[PDB]
């Protein structure tokens, strides 16, 4: 049993797969702490630090990203990690846990669950 979600930015699309495990997070086969722009390391670690290391201990997430850029991928990774957990706690944990996760995760930053509807504007003759 597992849950398959997505999160997006301008063009950087992510897909996340979460199932039972011991608490490892991988992106494109690499750990969460080896993703290349180390200045924005906290944006990758925000859903882990807001919720706690204990809350992620029952789930293993593997994330794949394609497209966009260096910071557009980080904003899509952090979205689909948090969105994978709120979907996993809904279907296989009681809704009281899912409501309190979705509560504190929106009051921090609204882009962890609801995507940013901003895309490049076209040009016409």
């Amino acid at each position: 049993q597992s849950v398959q979600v997505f999160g997006r930015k301008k063009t950087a699309t992510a897909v996340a797969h979460c199932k039972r495990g011991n608490g490892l997070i991988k992106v494109n086969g690499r750990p969460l702490e080896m993703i290349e722009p180390r200045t924005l390391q906290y944006k990758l670690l925000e859903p882990v630090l807001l919720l706690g290391k204990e809350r992620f201990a029952g789930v293993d997430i593997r994330v794949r990203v394609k497209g966009g850029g260096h910071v557009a991928q980080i904003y899509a990774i952090r979205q689909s990690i948090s969105k994978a957990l709120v979907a996993y706690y809904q279907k296989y944990v009681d809704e009281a846990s899912k409501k309190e996760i979705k509560d504190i995760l929106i009051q921090y930053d609204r882009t962890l669950l609801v995507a940013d509807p901003r895309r490049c504007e076209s040009k016409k003759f």
């Binding site: 398959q4 979600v5 897909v15 969105k83 979907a87 995507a115």
Partner: protein, 55 residues
């Protein structure tokens, strides 16, 4: 073909899909085919009596 909108009508391209984003989307849900789509989402004169005027 028989709904009210379809009958009262004033009369590459097929691979396009619209994801919808609520509860977060799960691709491994058995009812996920509901949340993907295949197409686009989303005059006469009146008398003083109120009767229509047709010509």
């Amino acid at each position: 073909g028989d709904s009210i909108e379809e009958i009262l009508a004033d009369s590459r391209q097929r691979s396009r899909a619209w994801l919808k984003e609520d509860e977060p989307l799960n691709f491994l849900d058995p009812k996920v085919a509901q949340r993907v789509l295949a197409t686009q989402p989303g005059g006469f004169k009146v008398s003083a009596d109120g009767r229509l005027i047709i010509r």
